[PDB]
Amino acid sequence: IATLYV
Amino acid sequence: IATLYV
Amino acid sequence: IATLYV
Amino acid sequence: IATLYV
Amino acid sequence: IATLYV
Amino acid sequence: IATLYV
Amino acid sequence: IATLYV
Amino acid sequence: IATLYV
Amino acid sequence: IATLYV
Amino acid sequence: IATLYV
Amino acid sequence: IATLYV
Amino acid sequence: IATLYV
Amino acid sequence: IATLYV
Amino acid sequence: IATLYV
Amino acid sequence: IATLYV
Amino acid sequence: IATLYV
Amino acid sequence: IATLYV
Amino acid sequence: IATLYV
Amino acid sequence: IATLYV
Amino acid sequence: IATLYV
Amino acid sequence: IATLYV
Amino acid sequence: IATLYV
Amino acid sequence: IATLYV
Amino acid sequence: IATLYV
Amino acid sequence: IATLYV
Amino acid sequence: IATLYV
Amino acid sequence: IATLYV
Amino acid sequence: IATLYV
Amino acid sequence: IATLYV
Amino acid sequence: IATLYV
Amino acid sequence: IATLYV
Amino acid sequence: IATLYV
Amino acid sequence: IATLYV
Amino acid sequence: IATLYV
Amino acid sequence: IATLYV
Amino acid sequence: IATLYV
DSSP states (O other), X not given: OEXXXX | OEXXXX | OXXXXX | XXXXXX | OEXXXX | OEEXXX | OEEXXX | XXXXXX | XXXXXX | OXXXXX | OEXXXX | OEEXXX | XXXXXO | OEXXXX | XXXXXX | OXXXXX | OXXXXX | OEEXXX | OXXXXX | OEXXXX | OXXXXX | OEXXXX | OEEXXX | OXXXXX | XXXXXX | OEXXXX | XXXXXX | OEEXXX | OEXXXX | OEEXXX | OXXXXX | OEXXXX | XXXXXX | XXXXXX | OEEXXX | OEXXXX
C-alpha cells in the first residue's frame, strides 16, 4: 500500500 | 494531489 | 489498483 | 484530473 | 479497467 | 474528457 | 469495451 | 464527441 | 459494435 | 454526425 | 504532505 | 510501516 | 514534521 | 520502532 | 524535537 | 530504548 | 534537553 | 540505564 | 457470435 | 446498451 | 467471451 | 456499467 | 477473467 | 466501483 | 487474483 | 476502499 | 497475499 | 486503515 | 507477515 | 496505531 | 517478532 | 506506547 | 527480548 | 516508563 | 537481564 | 526509579 496527499 | 497504489 | 486525483 | 487502473 | 476524467 | 477501457 | 466523451 | 467500441 | 456521435 | 457498425 | 507505505 | 506528515 | 517507521 | 516529531 | 527508537 | 526531547 | 537509553 | 537532563 | 446495440 | 457473446 | 456496456 | 467475462 | 466497472 | 477476478 | 476499488 | 487478494 | 486500504 | 497479510 | 496501521 | 507480526 | 506503537 | 517482542 | 516504553 | 527483558 | 526506569 | 538484575 503506497499513498500520498499534497 | 491524492494518489494510492495497492 | 492505481489511482490519482489532481 | 481523476484516473483509476485496476 | 482503465479510466480517466479531465 | 471522460474515457473508460475494460 | 472502449469509450470516450469530449 | 461520444464514441463506443465493444 | 462501433458507434460515434459528433 | 451519428454512425453505427455491428 | 501526508504519505504512508505498508 | 513508513509514514510522514509535513 | 511527524514520521514513524515500524 | 523509529519516530520523530519536529 | 521529540524522537524515540525501540 | 533510546529517546531524546529538545 | 531530556534523554534516556535503556 | 543512562539518562541526562539539562 | 451474438451481439445487440440499443 | 452494447453487448457481445462469443 | 461475454461483455456488456450500459 | 462495463463488464467482461472470459 | 471477470471484471466490472460502475 | 472497479473489480477484477482472475 | 481478486481486487476491488470503491 | 482498495483491496487485493492473491 | 491479502491487503486492504480504507 | 492500511493492513497486509502474507 | 501481518501488519496494520490506523 | 502501527503493529507488525512476523 | 511482535511490535506495536500507539 | 512502543513495545517489541523477539 | 521483551521491551516497553510509555 | 522504560523496561527491557533479555 | 531485567531492567526498569520510571 | 532505576533498577537492573543480571
